[PDB]
């Protein structure tokens, strides 16, 4: 089966991913955790960044990475903020 989601990357995570967004295919009911883990395995540098990131899902801060994804979801990847 499977579902497709869009990852949008920012700042250091965009740099390490090599792109501003990626369509990712997962099993139905795949968790935010399974998604991030899959990205992490693929690139060592990106993983190091990814592990200090916060995440949004259709705009909302993901508070529990055990939450399941739906087709069409958008996952924002936010490195730690560095303003000023």
């Amino acid at each position: 089966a499977g579902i497709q989601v869009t990852v949008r990357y920012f700042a250091a995570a965009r740099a390490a991913a090599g792109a501003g967004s990626e369509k990712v295919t997962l099993r139905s009911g795949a968790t935010v955790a399974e998604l991030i883990d899959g990205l992490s395995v693929r690139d060592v540098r990106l993983a190091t960044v990814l592990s200090r990131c916060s995440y949004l899902r259709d705009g909302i801060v993901v508070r529990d990475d055990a939450v399941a994804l739906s087709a069409g979801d958008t996952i924002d990847v936010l490195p730690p903020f560095a303003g000023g």
């Binding site: 920012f10 700042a11 250091a12 903020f81 303003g83 000023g84």
Partner: protein
């Protein structure tokens, strides 16, 4: 009703003087202003430039943050802040805030609390470029 003259996210040059001018209020006896500019060095390396990027939500978050700091304040007539994004040269201003209060204590306090709120809670990121050719994402080294 403490007021917000500005809470702007922009790729244009920003100015302390302009924000001082904005928060002027006939009942304010103190203004305090902040400018955060790009330093020439970081961690012992010479800086070539900084690049600032922002989440799509940053303009809205910025406005909410300035609004919030304003409402929770006491003794403060008016506030105004801008955060610049895009390509900044060494020496250029990334962040400017100004606060007009009835007396100096609220101006200093609220201006420091506003700069601190924005730096902590605004989704923008700075990419530093060094003269030695290297570069670095602050907060994700």
């Amino acid at each position: 009703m403490t007021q917000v003259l500005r809470a702007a996210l922009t790729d244009q040059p920003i100015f302390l003087a302009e924000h001082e001018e904005l928060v002027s209020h006939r009942s304010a006896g103190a203004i305090v202003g902040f400018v955060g500019m790009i330093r020439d060095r970081d961690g012992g390396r010479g800086v070539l430039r900084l690049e600032y990027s922002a989440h799509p939500s940053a303009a809205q978050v910025l406005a909410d943050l300035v609004a919030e700091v304003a409402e929770e304040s006491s003794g403060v007539r008016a506030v105004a802040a801008s955060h610049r994004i895009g390509v900044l040269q060494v020496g250029e201003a990334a962040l400017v805030a100004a606060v007009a209060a009835d007396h100096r204590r609220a101006a200093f306090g609220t201006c420091a609390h506003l700069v601190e709120t924005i730096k902590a809670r605004l989704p923008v990121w700075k990419h530093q470029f060094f003269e030695d050719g290297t570069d670095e994402w602050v907060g994700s080294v």
